[PDB]
Amino acid sequence: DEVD
Amino acid sequence: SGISLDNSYKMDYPEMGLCIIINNKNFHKSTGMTSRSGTDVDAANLRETFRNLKYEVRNKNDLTREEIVELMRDVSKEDHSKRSSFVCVLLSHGEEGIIFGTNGPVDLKKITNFFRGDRCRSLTGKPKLFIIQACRGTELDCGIETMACHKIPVEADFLYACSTAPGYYSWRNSKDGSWFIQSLCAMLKQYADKLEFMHILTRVNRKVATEFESFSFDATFHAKKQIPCIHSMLTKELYFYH
């Protein structure tokens, strides 16, 4: 899981 | 003939319309923006999804801010007279009101303005859908355990299907794609022949809100949730079928  | 109803957009033009997908994965080193692993999964999923809805799909990858503006301007100057709708999907970094080109930001209002009722006349009265997977800020959601008339507004008939709430980060999985795009394609596949588009997007909201939660070794980013936000300025119901 990564954020944009 | 008999009594007629017109609460739904006319979707039986010869073509459904264009689906432009801008997939920004790799950014110029100088911007300091991280690569967006998993975004190619999103782009491929969207291509297949919109192909099955009979859109003319065009995929673009790693566009600079200048290229994004030029693309959007050129597309808005095409003759859409034979097309029912227009769809644009933006996959990138962002913050509120901004989408990133590979080398810098683009004003979302600038992009959408090309398609205003008075500026793209062959799309006047037709639904213009902007689907956006990008951050809208840096907030994290901790979750909780359970007479007549002759003009229309130039901003009418737009819909922004945003991946996340205003002010919030948006989540993307490096293996599976973004939570929102994964969910959107799944719901379109299952329901595009059955439900009106707002109802499909509502099911996307539920899927993202209920089925995903972040996992992180960093406590600040662990166990977080997401709710997409539908921003609708549509004036009719939108069914992808006719």
Report the candidate in B81, B85, B76, B80 with the shortest Cα–Cα distance to residue B11.
B85
The answer to whether the CB of B135 falls within 8 A of the CB of B142 is no
Residue count of chain B, please give it: 242
Angle made by CA atoms B37, B43, B48, in degrees to the nearest 5: 145
Q: What technique solved it?
A: X-ray
| Cβ contacts of B77-80, under 8 Å, gap ≥ 24 | B77/B120, B78/B18, B78/B122, B79/B122, B80/B17, B80/B18, B80/B120, B80/B122, B80/B123, B80/B126
Instruction: Please count the residue pairs, one from chain A and one from chain B, whose beta carbons lie less than 8 angstroms apart.
Output: 35
Indicate if B135 belongs to the active site: yes
CA distance B11 to B238: 8
Residue given tokens 């600040």 in the structure block: B220
Which residue type, as a one-letter code, is found at position B16? Answer: M
CB atoms within 10 A of CB B66: 13
**Chain A environment of B173 (Cβ under 8 Å):** 1-2
The total number of structural domains that make up chain B: 1
CA distance B129 to B20: 10
| CATH classification of the domain holding B71 | 3.40.50.1460
Which residue type, as a one-letter code, is found at position B8? Answer: S
* PDB resolution in Å: 1.7
Whole domain around residue B62: which residue ranges? 1-242
**Chain A environment of B135 (Cβ under 8 Å):** 3-4
The answer to whether the CB of B13 falls within 8 A of the CB of B84 is yes
Residue B65 C-beta-side C-alpha neighbours within 13 Å: 14
